[PDB]
């Protein structure tokens with residue numbers, strides 16, 4: 001016989017202070033027992049399990065499950081209790097490749113490594129924790145006791161230990177053959193290359209020879225599976241990729257659960273189908289989690305669905321990554337906090353697409369949202385391709401310069417160019433840095449009684465213009481915004497406004513162009529119509545003239 | 557040659573921090589660095605029974621052509637036992653901040669000469685990711701004291717005092733302070749003599765070494781000339797209504813820091829409902845109050861003391877045109893240091909690079925003055941900071957930070 005290198009075992013421990021499982025074996029039918037005894041005799045003949053004596057105090061339940069539509073039984077060892085007690089492992093699939101970062105391949109062969117899948121040795125000191133018992137016929141003898149010698153399917157550590165063991169085996173082959181790629185998924189090896197199929201099939205044979213060094217045999221009759229591969233919800237082809245078919249159902253009535261399924265499919269589709277939208281369809285799941293409740297579809301959601309159906313009418317494919325070319329990312333504003341993007345290298349050949357949704361917040365503006373979309377695309381691109389794409393953005397260079405230079409926060413977006421495709425992101429207003437000569441000065445104030453919720457808002461100006469409005473169902477903060485609104489409404493095109501409201505100043509200094517508060521939205525609409533606005537803050541209750549006067553008027 | 561036993565704090569598992577996305581160039585750099593470190597025995601590959609992780613990346617230190625590995629041990633440092641087996645601490649040298657020149661040396665490579673306790677090594681696990689996760693990340697752990705871990709200078713301290721015993725008695729007026737991987741060396745000599753003694757010092761550790769990749773560098777500070785920012789009021793011949801409003805606003809703010817500040821007489825100049833741009837003559841009760849406030853503002857703040865048991869907090873404001881102001885404090889309105897920068901280099905079109913350089917300079921000042929790093933309140937969205945700061949980082953330590961999302965009114969007053 002040819003000596004084979006043994007696979008070093010991974011040392012395994014229970015979580016600190018825990019003992020192994022001691023779970024009672026369910027009684028089984030005479031029929032199931034005989035099936036389990038034969039199953040285990042074969043497994044024992046192959047070395048996967050060994051009989052043990054009654055010393056071992058651990059136990060895990062074993063079951064016999066009928067393969068649907070067959071006389072054959074199947075053995076199921078239920079490791080749920082041992083898994084709770086087994087240490088955590090390093091999981092290496094804490095991240096799956098995205099197809100858009102893959103490289104085009106001339107050939108991809110699949111090799112079956114199922115016979116190593118069930119042949120990696122288990123740490124000798126841990127085997128005792130895997131003990132199980134086949135019950136005896138009529139319970140008149142001791143059950144037959146076994147423990148595992150190899151990684152058991154369904155045990156918490158098996159996928160991580162199997163993958164780390166196969167990786168270690170493959171590492172020198174991959175290192176000395178940099179003209180191929182190897183990827184392990186379940187019990188298959190996928191080997192791709194750009195080699196002429198002769199050389200490619202040579203490497204495949206050399207890989208089979210390399211695997212034999214560990215006694216890992218691979219089937220001769222070449223694998224059933226060929227390109228295209230169905231994998232992780234995608235279709236992988238030699239030179240393009242797509243998501244598996246997305247078919248949106250027809251329904252007269254939509255439950256909560258159908259709406260969740262629909263949004264999930266749309267989100268999946270949005271990585272290659274450009275322009276997918278889900279805002280209005282997601283708005284219907286707001287708050288409620290009664291998974292069988294039927295919801296009427298707003299005209300808005302009906303329109304979104306219609307748009308999406310058109311986008312999904314015919315198949316769309318992505319191309320693979322060419323590392324010799326720049327990556328370009330183009331972003332469009334879609335409305336209602338929705339943004340969409342495409343990443344490509346050649347015009348009209350996307351690598352992938354995607355979308356970004358406005359964060360939940362009280363106030364916002366387009367420039368902040370575009371900025372966040374850029375950071376998210378940047379980070380996703382680092383993951384997929386290891387580099388930042390060049391951006392094509394619907395915002396003028398002068399607009400960005402004005403924004404970043406005057407914004408109170410530090411902010412930055414990487415190398416980008418203006419793309420003139422409406423709707424453009426713009427600054428809807430900018431406050432003055434200095435008081436305006438010749439513009440009327442409005443001293444504004446508001447106050448409310450917290451008990452009654454009654455209040456007043458108003459202003460007095462240097463021209464003697466004055467207004468006070470009585471208000472109901474209001475708060476101090478709302479009346480301070482109302483006062484600013486009244487000053488904007490009643491002034492000319494240029495105006496100086498003096499407030500003592502730290503709250504209003506905090507909002508306006510954030511430069512919103514849209515708010516959840518309809519009062520803030522009205523202020524924004526007034527600001528957009530002005531030519532010049534200077535907003536000045538003073539401390540309250542300091543006898544500041546004009547301020548003190550309207551404070552008395554409104555707090556009465 | 558023998559390992560000091562090290563433990564985590566009680567009821568505390570090892571770090572399990574997720575590796576952040578790395579660019580292709582940083583990955584390739586880390587693969588080269590770690591291949592060599594593994595050959596030299598400093599790190600070893602680990603298996604899946606080790607579930608711990610600490611992030612890693614790579615930097616190019618100030619003025620260099622070579623990548624440096626930087627492990628972000630912030631989480632492991634929080635979870636590692638405190639170190640007062642031999643030393644309750646190294647009482648921080650108050651003379652360091654008074655020297656005319658301080659040079660900062662990267663001496664972290666010396667730590668690679670001491671083995672790490674075999675039972676603690678697992679907690680130093682890290683991963684070199686692969687682009688698009690196409691191949692399994694390369695997993696390693698340290699066999700020797702790692703750079704950036706708080707235990708490393710502690711365990712190496714006995715070694716380090718012995719190496720510099722000669723240089724210290726030969727130069728008894730030089731202050732030497734070690735923080736993490738840095739050695740701070742302060743002299744009052746002229747900079748040419750200073751540079752010589754620094755190179756003198758480098759030779760001791762080259763000799764003891766028998767090669768350190770970044771020992772030859774020197775970051776030169778002159779804490780002698782470090783400037784502060786008292787509160788100052790405008791001196792004007794004509795005051796508009798707007799000017800006086802801003803003055804009363806600033807003085808009201810200052811009165812939270814300085815008790816005896818008054819605004820009553822200044823407020824009385826406002827009273828009418830006047831145009832903002834109208835010039836107001838100062839009455840004399842107002843001029844006197846203003847002069848009294850000016851003199852109050854020339855004195856130090858009352859009851860300001862440093863407490864080594866409390867965190868230092870650093871706040872930063874963007875002032876525009878490349879200018880940044882900052883304050884270091886432990887209690888609100890009790891500033892231990894204030895300051896202002898403008899020379900943010902190589903960043904006139906990049907706010908985030910400028911902020912990152914400010915953070916590093918403030919941290920350096922904090923280390924020199926108190927021997928610890930502050931917690932930053934950063935005027936930036938978390939997603940923007942987290943995407944970019946590692947591109948501009950050149951220090952071998954990393955402080956803690958949080959994010960300010962509401963605009964501070966007080967930015968005006970530090971301007």
Ligand SMILES: Cc1cc(/C=C/C#N)cc(C)c1Nc1ccnc(Nc2ccc(C#N)cc2)n1
Nearest residue numbers: 102103105181183190192227229231236237238
């Ligand atoms: C991640 C991955 C999944 C599968 C397969 C999973 C399946 N199931 C197969 C392979 C070979 C890989 N690994 C890589 C790595 C780099 N480029 C590529 N390009 C590439 C891969 C597949 C096809 C196909 N045709 C075309 C190009 N694949």
Ligand SMILES: [Mg+2]
Nearest residue numbers: 445447540551
């Ligand atoms: Mg008031």
